[PDB]
Enzyme design. Structure first.
Site, short mmCIF file in Angstrom:
data_model
loop_
_atom_site.label_atom_id
_atom_site.label_comp_id
_atom_site.label_asym_id
_atom_site.label_seq_id
_atom_site.Cartn_x
_atom_site.Cartn_y
_atom_site.Cartn_z
N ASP A 1 -60.11 -17.94 24.58
CA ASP A 1 -61.47 -17.15 24.46
C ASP A 1 -61.37 -15.97 24.67
O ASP A 1 -62.54 -15.21 25.14
CB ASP A 1 -62.55 -18.06 25.45
CG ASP A 1 -63.96 -17.84 24.99
OD1 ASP A 1 -64.24 -17.67 23.77
OD2 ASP A 1 -64.93 -17.97 25.68
N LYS B 1 -62.23 -12.30 23.86
CA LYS B 1 -63.34 -11.53 23.10
C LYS B 1 -64.31 -10.50 24.28
O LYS B 1 -63.81 -10.50 25.40
CB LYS B 1 -64.54 -12.43 22.69
CG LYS B 1 -65.19 -13.14 23.70
CD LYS B 1 -66.17 -14.56 23.24
CE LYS B 1 -66.77 -15.13 24.49
NZ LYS B 1 -67.41 -16.29 24.13
N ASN C 1 -65.46 -11.02 27.44
CA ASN C 1 -64.59 -11.49 28.35
C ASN C 1 -63.51 -10.45 28.81
O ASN C 1 -62.67 -10.73 29.52
CB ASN C 1 -64.05 -12.89 28.10
CG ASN C 1 -64.96 -14.05 27.97
OD1 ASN C 1 -65.97 -14.08 28.26
ND2 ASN C 1 -64.50 -14.74 27.21
N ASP D 1 -62.97 -15.14 32.61
CA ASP D 1 -63.58 -16.41 31.72
C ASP D 1 -62.47 -17.37 31.48
O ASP D 1 -62.12 -17.61 30.25
CB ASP D 1 -64.25 -16.05 30.81
CG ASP D 1 -65.26 -17.06 30.17
OD1 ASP D 1 -66.01 -17.29 29.27
OD2 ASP D 1 -64.81 -18.46 30.78
N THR E 1 -34.78 -42.17 20.04
CA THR E 1 -34.69 -42.65 18.59
C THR E 1 -36.20 -42.86 17.79
O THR E 1 -37.11 -43.57 18.44
CB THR E 1 -33.58 -43.85 18.35
OG1 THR E 1 -32.40 -43.43 18.98
CG2 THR E 1 -33.74 -43.88 16.79
C1 LIG Z 1 -72.44 -4.01 35.47
O1 LIG Z 1 -73.07 -4.87 34.75
C2 LIG Z 1 -72.71 -5.95 34.02
C3 LIG Z 1 -71.51 -6.36 35.26
C4 LIG Z 1 -70.94 -8.04 34.76
N1 LIG Z 1 -70.01 -8.43 35.74
C5 LIG Z 1 -69.28 -9.76 35.37
C6 LIG Z 1 -68.21 -10.09 36.35
C7 LIG Z 1 -67.63 -11.51 35.94
C8 LIG Z 1 -66.51 -11.84 36.65
F1 LIG Z 1 -65.95 -13.16 36.31
C9 LIG Z 1 -65.95 -11.18 37.85
C10 LIG Z 1 -66.43 -9.75 37.93
C11 LIG Z 1 -67.66 -9.29 37.29
O2 LIG Z 1 -68.15 -8.23 37.87
N2 LIG Z 1 -69.60 -10.47 34.19
C12 LIG Z 1 -70.66 -10.02 33.32
N3 LIG Z 1 -70.77 -10.94 32.24
C13 LIG Z 1 -69.95 -12.07 31.67
C14 LIG Z 1 -68.84 -11.90 31.41
N4 LIG Z 1 -68.24 -13.16 30.35
C15 LIG Z 1 -69.86 -13.10 29.35
C16 LIG Z 1 -70.83 -12.85 30.55
C17 LIG Z 1 -71.87 -13.72 31.03
C18 LIG Z 1 -72.17 -14.58 29.89
C19 LIG Z 1 -71.03 -14.75 31.86
O3 LIG Z 1 -72.68 -13.46 31.58
C20 LIG Z 1 -71.13 -8.55 33.65
C21 LIG Z 1 -72.75 -8.13 32.75
C22 LIG Z 1 -72.95 -6.88 33.25
O4 LIG Z 1 -74.19 -6.43 32.31
C23 LIG Z 1 -74.35 -7.13 31.00
MG LIG Z 2 -64.51 -15.95 35.43
#
Ligand SMILES: COc1cc2nc(-c3cc(F)ccc3O)nc(N[C@@H]3CNC[C@H]3C(C)(C)O)c2cc1OC
Ligand SMILES: [Mg+2]
Ligand SMILES: COc1cc2nc(-c3cc(F)ccc3O)nc(N[C@@H]3CNC[C@H]3C(C)(C)O)c2cc1OC
Ligand SMILES: [Mg+2]
Lengths: 286, 286
Positions: free
Chosen positions: A123, A125, A128, A144, A161
């Site tokens: 996944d 992208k 992620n 992710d 076989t």
């Molecule tokens: C600073 O602003 C932001 C910080 C973020 N930090 C993490 C973050 C995720 C981790 F797994 C570990 C450390 C992290 O900081 N993950 C975000 N978003 C995720 C990433 N995959 C898709 C999305 C969703 C849909 C899950 O929300 C952030 C989105 C932000 O703005 C939109």
């Molecule tokens: Mg994660």
């Protein structure tokens, strides 16, 4: 409310993003430092992800700090203050080719490391890929691992076989063990988008189905936008977007590609590295 | 020595067969009845098999009575005094076509039942077909679910937009969900052997590789042996040994095939059925 065991160790704060999963800013009580907490609403996806995350140790792969199994799932991770790579490329925004290179190099290292360790992300992208700071030159980390897969029954079947063995099984032997190539394809798409500010395959102003664009491998080439971009870069993209998974460039081949033989970019990465490390470097025998 | 918990309930006796797994005759202390005990030397294969076996309930599928997890694995099952179908067909021995039919009909029912219940056997062969008595007209049961598979991530992948999705994944959609056909192929091989006394594909007196015989689907047809056999039967074989898994006959199509529209055979099966049942039939509301 949040679980008592979580509340015990962390003060929850703002929502950073949501959410198909939600991510919140939190503070670790013990250190007063910022962390991120991913909230996944209530299972096997998660234990896999946790166990995968626990075992992995690479600078460009997100690290897990803590985990809570409650009315919902709570994963505590190092905070990525820079947010998603997605935001840097949305609305035809485009990075300097040299920023693309620095980022892409890290992605390649990360995914190479996953493959060496028998893990396929599946996944990859821009949403992620997280940036470690608000600087244009920073460390990136892949996140992710919910769709990940640990890389068989085919091997066991081949030991005997084939008297009773179906034809399609024997035919699948030709291509077995190339599942990891799907990550290289995605990386190809991500790089295309980073370089150009637009998707190689989409339903925008075309009559060809998305499916048909992809299986034929006819990406949308717009010379005006790509003219700005080097030919070394575009050449790498073209080797990642190869339809045949056996011919497609692997992470190693990509890392050996001329576009990435760039010692200036590599120095900048080693710098950001030691820079991140300084605060936790214990002394050592000289 | 045997585990104390096993010894507590059963008196172990002669080895019935070994073994790549071993099977021993045993007596249940409580009833003084004969059982079979399969000994698998020390894991995931087994818990799967156990859980699969526990959930299944069909006259032509082996039933589990007890299980012991020790220095080795001990599975207690209903005894099949007739032994393997293998012994009835080894050394060009061949069954009356009508015996083939009775047996094959039961195999088809069993495997149809597995497929209805989302289970693929994946190792059907004469050694995994057991006869319930030493009579030529008996009940058969499928055994050995160690290679079985419970029938996805493809579906989940299809729910979103394929922007980053690899071509080979989209191409696999054409054939996804036909894994169960491998069982029908094996059944085709088993029926060929039962009818004819020899293997459709083998390295015996030929220069074609086993692999090439199978993927081309060119079975070894010996008219002298097959002349004895009906054309309805040979026709069914030919529809099971179809190389294309999407065109191959399913269990349903096989059960609707003229060779199996045989009310005499079907009566004999219902007889053996009620016959087996008599000793355990509780009374019921009229
Ligand atoms: C600073 O602003 C932001 C910080 C973020 N930090 C993490 C973050 C995720 C981790 F797994 C570990 C450390 C992290 O900081 N993950 C975000 N978003 C995720 C990433 N995959 C898709 C999305 C969703 C849909 C899950 O929300 C952030 C989105 C932000 O703005 C939109
Ligand atoms: Mg994660
Ligand atoms: C009467 O003589 C025999 C009775 C048998 N009963 C069971 C048996 C197995 C079950 F799972 C349940 C009830 C049963 O009776 N299984 C046998 N053998 C197995 C079947 N698969 C291959 C083979 C191997 C290699 C494991 O030994 C017997 C072999 C015999 O002679 C060779
Ligand atoms: Mg068994």
């Amino acid at each position: 409310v949040y679980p008592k065991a979580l509340r015990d160790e962390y003060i929850m704060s703002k929502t950073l993003g949501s959410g198909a999963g939600e991510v919140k800013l939190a503070f670790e009580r013990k250190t007063c430092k910022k962390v991120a907490i991913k909230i996944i609403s209530k299972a096997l996806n998660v234990e896999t992800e946790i166990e995968i995350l626990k075992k992995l140790n690479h600078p460009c792969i997100i690290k897990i700090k803590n985990f809570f199994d409650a009315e919902d799932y709570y994963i505590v991770l190092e905070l990525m203050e820079g947010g998603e790579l997605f935001d840097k490329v949305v609305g035809n925004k485009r990075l300097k080719e040299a920023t693309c290179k620095l980022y892409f190099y890290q992605m390649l290292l990360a995914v190479q490391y996953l493959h060496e360790n028998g893990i396929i992300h599946r996944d990859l992208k821009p949403e992620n890929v997280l940036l470690s700071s608000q600087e244009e030159d920073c460390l990136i980390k892949i996140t992710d691992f919910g769709h990940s897969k640990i890389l068989t029954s085919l091997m066991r079947t081949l030991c005997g076989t084939p008297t009773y063995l179906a034809p399609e099984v024997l035919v699948s032997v030709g291509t077995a063990g190339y599942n990891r190539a799907v990550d290289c394809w995605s990386l190809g798409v991500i790089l295309f988008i980073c370089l150009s500010g637009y998707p190689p395959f989409s339903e925008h102003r075309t009559q060809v189905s998305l499916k048909d664009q992809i299986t034929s491998g006819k990406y949308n080439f717009i010379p005006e936008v790509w003219a700005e971009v080097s030919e070394k870069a575009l050449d790498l993209v073209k080797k990642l977007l190869v339809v045949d998974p056996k011919a497609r460039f692997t992470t190693e081949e990509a890392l050996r590609h001329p576009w990435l033989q760039d010692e200036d970019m590599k120095r900048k990465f080693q710098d950001l590295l030691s820079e991140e490390n300084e605060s936790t470097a214990l002394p050592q025998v000289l």
